[PDB]
Design a protein around this ligand. Structure first.
Ligand SMILES: CCCCCCCCCCCCCCCC(=O)OC[C@H](COP(=O)(O)OCCN)OC(=O)CCCCCCCCCCCCCCC
Ligand SMILES: *[C@@H]1O[C@H](CO)[C@@H](O[C@@H]2O[C@H](CO)[C@@H](O[C@@H]3O[C@H](CO)[C@@H](O)[C@H](O)[C@@H]3O)[C@H](O)[C@H]2NC(C)=O)[C@H](O)[C@H]1NC(C)=O
Ligand SMILES: *[C@@H]1O[C@H](CO)[C@@H](O[C@@H]2O[C@H](CO)[C@@H](O[C@@H]3O[C@H](CO)[C@@H](O)[C@H](O)[C@@H]3O)[C@H](O)[C@H]2NC(C)=O)[C@H](O)[C@H]1NC(C)=O
Ligand SMILES: *[C@@H]1O[C@H](CO)[C@@H](O[C@@H]2O[C@H](CO)[C@@H](O[C@@H]3O[C@H](CO)[C@@H](O)[C@H](O)[C@@H]3O)[C@H](O)[C@H]2NC(C)=O)[C@H](O)[C@H]1NC(C)=O
Ligand SMILES: *[C@@H]1O[C@H](CO)[C@@H](O[C@@H]2O[C@H](CO)[C@@H](O[C@@H]3O[C@H](CO)[C@@H](O)[C@H](O)[C@@H]3O)[C@H](O)[C@H]2NC(C)=O)[C@H](O)[C@H]1NC(C)=O
Ligand SMILES: CCCCCCCCOCCOCCOCCOCCO
Ligand SMILES: CCCCCCCCOCCOCCOCCOCCO
Ligand SMILES: CCCCCCCCOCCOCCOCCOCCO
Ligand SMILES: CCCCCCCCOCCOCCOCCOCCO
Ligand SMILES: CCCCCCCCOCCOCCOCCOCCO
Ligand SMILES: CCCCCCCCOCCOCCOCCOCCO
Ligand SMILES: CCCCCCCCOCCOCCOCCOCCO
Ligand SMILES: CCCCCCCCOCCOCCOCCOCCO
Ligand SMILES: CCCCCCCCOCCOCCOCCOCCO
Ligand SMILES: CCCCCCCCOCCOCCOCCOCCO
Ligand SMILES: *C/C=C(C)/C=C\C=C(C)\C=C\C1=C(C)CCCC1(C)C
Ligand SMILES: *C/C=C(C)/C=C\C=C(C)\C=C\C1=C(C)CCCC1(C)C
Ligand SMILES: CCCCCCCCCCCC[N+](C)(C)[O-]
Ligand SMILES: CCCCCCCCCCCC[N+](C)(C)[O-]
Ligand SMILES: [Zn+2]
Ligand SMILES: [Zn+2]
Lengths: 328, 328
């Protein structure tokens, strides 16, 4: 056996030497050097200390400024909340788990770590869908003469939570399950075993198709309609050069947010897909550790892209932080 | 301009030196060394000389042996025909084009090269869908007391031609268009320009989503049902170890055919997707030439996998070739 399966775990280390132990019962220092567990710990700590303030700040500044009530403003406020859930709901546990070298909080801890990570990533993905659609509707006016205003913003936000929970929750109640990965200090969906009792196989498929592929198809479609229009379906829809310069700022930003998401998650995606199609194959704890922990930067990069690419949000922020002036 | 757009072409070479010419009017030797055009020519020649006999042989041996009437037998005969269409309908033109260093047959030649390549590739893709579904139905028998027999085989084949033509033909009559790629000696879908008059943008999206992604989703789903069953949904189906050993031969083969397709086409897919999302960017003729011509091995690898992994087909072949003794 290249790995060591347990009732509820899969250590990617051979147990021919009898050293393997459950990620829920004892430290995993036999997996790698303890200084490496310290690095993860240190890493999560930074994510928590960076993520807590930038997201809260985003949330705070938005609520405080009434003029910030556009779909974008709404979507980023949403991510700010999702990130705070990742930070406090999951990172605190992954940090603590990394310090002890295992899930001292048992499966319940692993569920927290896996749930919120999955929730945060998915909220970010589906949020991208809502934004692409909003850019589609606002830059090409297809449908009719409807207003993707504040009302749809709310509906847009609720939507992201519905989809994301549709992906993150099932494994909490029987369909697939959260399980330790890599150095065993973070938890992800079970791509490691078939474990037919929780119908693992069908969930992984469901996840990659409905919670990865479909969303990308939708965004790709929207991207299609925007390239086309910025080319010929816009010169006839009379787009004042003054509006386009501010509607191009926003369109550029969504594209960047979409690229950042792919940069952040594709690595994890690939290793997961691989493991899933090579279960039992010979791979170490470092194989998934790097992509997994790297993906956790998803709790931080969005507010940052936001602050750096949306002048209005930036100025409001400086205003909030300087009390009065460098408003809404 | 990093490239040179023309009414119906896109040479990936700057025309600041005025050397660029239309791939329909003159040789493209300024793009690369003439010995490289000789390599392509030599290459196509081998594909033709290999593809003609292995496909025909496959087709011939199948028709000759009546016992060869299962879905697999049917699907591979289908590919054999698809490949002969690629060889004769397209490669002869790409060969000749490589020899002259340009499309002396003008756009009509380019359509031939692009159509049959696209047709052959897609027929292979959708054929994979039909096989995966057939493996699904036959190895897990989900639907009721149903029979995926000869009748469905025919319907399966017709199906692959319908989808493949749905992808290859539209660009012949106004939706997108076949255009020279790389060193300008092979033609592909227009990922190079927006050319709104033929609605390029929307076709590329349609192609990647309906003629790449969806098919992969379907196969992935089937692969899901097989891993699950070969695991805990088949030990209750009392699959006698005698049949499984022959039904595992076939299942293994389809999986290999699926992997070979990804090995063969993903490279092309990626460069196409890239070019499409980086139109006008600085890339040379070699950027697409290698993946494109590599993909053309799609006219040859399937019959070979077939001969090498299906003992029954292999034995019939030896029989056909040795006359009588080495049957159906
Ligand atoms: C973690 C922090 C990452 C913050 C990076 C965000 C800054 C981007 C500024 C926009 C650049 C103009 C074309 C260039 C695209 C650049 C992509 C940058 C995306 C950042 C990756 C974050 C993932 C980690
Ligand atoms: C655990 O990981 C190991 C790799 O570290 C996997 O072993 C590989 O298993 C395959 C399948 O049996 C071997 O292939 C066979 O090789 C022989 C050559 O003697 C050949 O005659 C057979 O037809 C077949 O191709 C392979 O050699 C072996 N190692 C390699 C090269 O990767 C193993 O499958 C994994 N699973 C477990 C827990 O066993
Ligand atoms: C990896 O293999 C090792 C051994 O090679 C496993 O060690 C296990 O260690 C426990 C001690 O906590 C053993 O339990 C003992 O069992 C005996 C009865 O056999 C009982 O009398 C003692 O009181 C004690 O409970 C356990 O037997 C032993 N297992 C093996 C393989 O011998 C280890 O569990 C393996 N890793 C895992 C969990 O996959
Ligand atoms: C043709 O290919 C060239 C690259 O070979 C592309 O040019 C690049 O265009 C980007 C902008 O789209 C340039 O970035 C800009 O750089 C300046 C620094 O002076 C910075 O202030 C701007 O904010 C921006 O980042 C990049 O420098 C440039 N590369 C070079 C060296 O030319 C070009 O886009 C392609 N298509 C065209 C327009 O022909
Ligand atoms: C790349 O640039 C070259 C030149 O830098 C393009 O070819 C040149 O095209 C011009 C304009 O079509 C030709 O000029 C002709 O002049 C006569 C004057 O009697 C006029 O009646 C024609 O209407 C035309 O303007 C010029 O002959 C030709 N230069 C040559 C001989 O190579 C070339 O078309 C560009 N690449 C492409 C095809 O985009
Ligand atoms: C809303 C997230 C709550 C996640 C923690 C609860 C799950 C802990 O229960 C452990 C049972 O293990 C089954 C998996
Ligand atoms: C168990 C249901 C979840 C499966 C969703 C994946 C997408 C399936 O579509 C493929 C069609 O078969
Ligand atoms: C290069 C493809 C090798 C074929 C392996 C079958 C899995 C299909 O690959 C998924 C497509 O992603 C391309 C990345 O290629 C890396 C190969 O690793 C296989 C991923 O599990
Ligand atoms: C698969 C390779 C992982 C891709 C991520 O590489 C980025 C490097 O950043 C390291 C940060 O990860 C923390 C551990
Ligand atoms: C962790 C991210 C911290 C980013 C700090 C951004 C603070 C504002 O940046 C100032 C840069 O000013 C450039 C444009 O601002 C317009 C004001 O004039
Ligand atoms: C069975 C399909 C054969 C395809 C031949 C196409 C030749 C027609 O091209 C001539 C002009 O068309 C260029 C427009 O694209
Ligand atoms: C004009 C036809 C293009 C449709 C291809 C994409 C279909 C799936 O995308 C979902 C629509 O949003
Ligand atoms: C995936 C990035 C693009 C690299 C192209 C992959 C080519 C595969 O290498 C095999 C070499 O055969 C190609 C020969 O055909 C050219 C003539
Ligand atoms: C060593 C390769 C690192 C470069 C990876 C760039 C990823 C950018 O994300 C774009 C998404 O594209 C999908 C797959 O990415 C592969 C290359 O990206 C080029 C886009 O065609
Ligand atoms: C270009 C295709 C070359 C394929 C040659 C295959 C010819 C048959 O190979 C003979 C090898 O025999 C091993 C298994 O055959 C069963 C007969 O016993
Ligand atoms: C550090 C903990 C992690 C990364 C735990 C779990 C993550 C997932 C189950 C992620 C799933 C996916 C998302 C968020 C977006 C891309 C596709 C995906 C299905 C791999
Ligand atoms: C040598 C000539 C070639 C490769 C010409 C054109 C090929 C296409 C338009 C291929 C399309 C695709 C296929 C066959 C399967 C994978 C996805 C795809 C859409 C890129
Ligand atoms: C940011 C790009 C990194 C790769 C992202 C896409 C990976 C999908 C294919 C899996 C290949 C990964 N690997 C090493 C696990 O084989
Ligand atoms: C719908 C998108 C499908 C894209 C598949 C991409 C496969 C990657 C193949 C290599 C592409 C990398 N690049 C940038 C050099 O072209
Ligand atoms: Zn509204
Ligand atoms: Zn039938």
């Amino acid at each position: 056996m290249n790995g060591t399966e347990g009732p509820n775990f899969y250590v990617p280390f051979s147990n021919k030497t009898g050293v393997v132990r459950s990620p829920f019962e004892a430290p995993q220092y036999y997996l790698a050097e303890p200084w490496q567990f310290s690095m993860l710990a240190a890493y999560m700590f930074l994510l928590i200390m960076l993520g807590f303030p930038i997201n809260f700040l985003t949330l705070y500044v938005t609520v405080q400024h009434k003029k910030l009530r556009t779909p974008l403003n709404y979507i980023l406020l949403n991510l700010a909340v999702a990130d705070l859930f990742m930070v406090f709901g999951g990172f605190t546990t992954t940090l603590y788990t990394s310090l002890h070298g295992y899930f001292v909080f048992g499966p319940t801890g692993c569920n927290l770590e896996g749930f919120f990570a999955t929730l945060g990533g998915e909220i970010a993905l589906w949020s991208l869908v809502v934004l692409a659609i909003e850019r589609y509707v606002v830059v090409c006016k297809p449908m009719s003469n409807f207003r993707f205003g504040e009302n749809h913003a709310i509906m847009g936000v609720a939507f992201t939570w519905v989809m994301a929970l549709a992906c993150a929750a099932p494994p909490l109640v029987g369909w697939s399950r959260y399980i330790p990965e890599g150095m065993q200090c973070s938890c992800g969906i079970d791509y490691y075993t078939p474990h037919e009792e929780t119908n693992n196989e069908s969930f992984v498929i469901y996840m990659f198709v409905v919670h990865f592929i479909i969303p990308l198809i939708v965004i790709f479609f929207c991207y299609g309609q925007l390239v086309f229009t910025v080319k010929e379906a816009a010169a006839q829809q009379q787009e004042s050069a003054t509006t386009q310069k501010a509607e191009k700022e926003v369109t550029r930003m969504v594209i960047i947010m979409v690229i950042a998401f792919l940069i952040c998650w594709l690595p994890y995606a690939g290793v997961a897909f691989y493991i899933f199609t090579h279960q039992g194959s010979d791979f170490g704890p470092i194989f998934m550790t790097i992509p997994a922990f790297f993906a956790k930067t998803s709790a931080v990069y969005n507010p940052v892209i936001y602050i750096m690419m949306n002048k209005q949000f930036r100025n409001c922020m400086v205003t909030t932080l300087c009390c009065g002036k460098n408003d809404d």
